[PDB]
A paper describes a structure:
Here, we describe the tsclx4-/Zn-directed assembly of two proteins: cationic α-helical cytochrome c (cyt c) and neutral β-propeller Ralstonia solanacearum lectin (RSL). Whereas sulfonato-calixarene (sclx4) consists of phenol monomers linked by methylene bridges, tsclx4 is bridged by sulfur atoms that enable metal coordination.
In each case, the lysine side chain was encapsulated by tsclx4 in the cone conformation. The calixarene formed multiple noncovalent bonds (e.g., hydrogen bonds between sulfonates and neighboring residues) and acted as a molecular glue. Therefore, in the absence of a transition metal, tsclx4 binds cyt c similar to other calixarenes, suggesting that the sulfur bridging atoms had minimal effect on the protein-binding capabilities of the macrocycle.
Numbering used by the authors:
A (entry chain A), B (entry chain B): -5 to -1, 1 to 103
Write the structure that this text describes.
């Protein structure tokens, strides 16, 4: 994947309408169906404190960056087989770019 | 992974010592053990004319770019499970960057 910075505004709206049902981003924000995502970039997968991950999420042991996050979000189950994240994926490169542009700033 | 442009000259040495046994780069070059790699960037995996890939490499259908190339070369069997490319991986990040710098130029 080739992440390129897009519209953080449109990405905020994508997060709100497709991810917020299971995730928060803010420092200290609640765990819900999925883990709070503060600090996700530059951390290995499966390490938010207080959350119970699948073994596959921890064991994939990917160091998240803008590029492997784009590949993951295209089809989560294909990048992390066995993940309990119920999400088919964002197929459009432009939507992933916008969303990841937002995530990069909102999760710090 | 995050590609960062490096030294084409060092990349060329890395290709000769670590890849040339199994691959060539020139247009019309021979399939040795692995496919000739001319045109690899911006093409999906498993498409070099005349080579017989594993089903795994074809099904992967990755659109090759500098970032997923670096991730692949770090550990090919992790990125394309089932591949017949017998190569443990290039663990040094600078070597990956240099080699991809060379590959982008030499496969065109
Ligand atoms: O995520 S969105 O809500 O935005 C979304 C956008 C599009 C869309 O059709 C859908 C959902 S609906 C859908 C849902 C699921 S799933 O949820 O069950 O997995 C699987 C499929 C599927 O069709 S099959 C399929 C899978 C993939 S892949 O997974 O990316 O390899 C690519 C294409 C394709 O047909 S082709 C293709 C290529 C592009 S482009 O922009 O990359 O050129 C865009 C689209 C394509 O269909 S529009
Ligand atoms: O901007 S770049 O970083 O890409 C870059 C471009 C060039 C360059 O010199 C360098 C760095 S500096 C350099 C780097 C490395 S290293 O990084 O590999 O350790 C080893 C050496 C070296 O001098 S020693 C050496 C060994 C041989 S050999 O005995 O024939 O193998 C030929 C040449 C040579 O200098 S001459 C030669 C050969 C080539 S080539 O790649 O077409 O073979 C290119 C050039 C040459 O001057 S331009
Ligand atoms: O380039 S070479 O392929 O010749 C090569 C270079 C280095 C090296 O140790 C080896 C081979 S030997 C080796 C072989 C195998 S294998 O046989 O199972 O494949 C597994 C490992 C292993 O260590 S374990 C391991 C795996 C990875 S990862 O796979 O990249 O995540 C990173 C590191 C690490 O320890 S840490 C690490 C980080 C860097 S840096 O430059 O990126 O900072 C460099 C090195 C590191 O060890 S030097
Ligand atoms: C409920 C149906 C979810 C939706 C919608 C989204 N996510 Fe998700 N996510 C969910 C769960 C239950 C988990 C844990 C999965 C496991 O196997 O343990 C996750 C995980 C992630 C991760 C990895 C977190 C980490 O490694 O620490 C990421 C990066 C992630 N989720 C991102 C994400 C995005 C960007 C979403 C909108 C496109 C999204 N998720 C939606 C549950 C659900
Ligand atoms: C023999 C021991 C090999 C070594 C050394 C290298 N490669 Fe390889 N490669 C090899 C095979 C048999 C295959 C086909 C694998 C399959 O499952 O069909 C490949 C494939 C690749 C690819 C993908 C090709 C494509 O999708 O068209 C790439 C990008 C690739 N090889 C790169 C590569 C590099 C950079 C190497 C040096 C670090 C290297 N290979 C060494 C066999 C062998």
């Amino acid at each position: 994947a080739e992440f390129k910075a897009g519209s953080a505004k449109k990405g905020a709206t994508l997060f709100k309408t497709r991810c917020l049902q299971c995730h928060t981003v803010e420092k200290g924000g609640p765990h819900k169906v999925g883990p709070n995502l503060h600090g996700i970039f530059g951390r290995h997968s499966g390490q938010a404190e207080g959350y119970s991950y699948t073994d596959a999420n921890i064991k994939k042991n990917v160091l998240w960056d803008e590029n492997n996050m784009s590949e993951y979000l295209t089809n989560p189950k294909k990048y992390i087989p066995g993940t309990k994240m119920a999400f088919g994926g964002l197929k459009k490169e432009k939507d992933r770019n916008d969303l990841i542009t937002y995530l990069k700033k909102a999760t710090e």
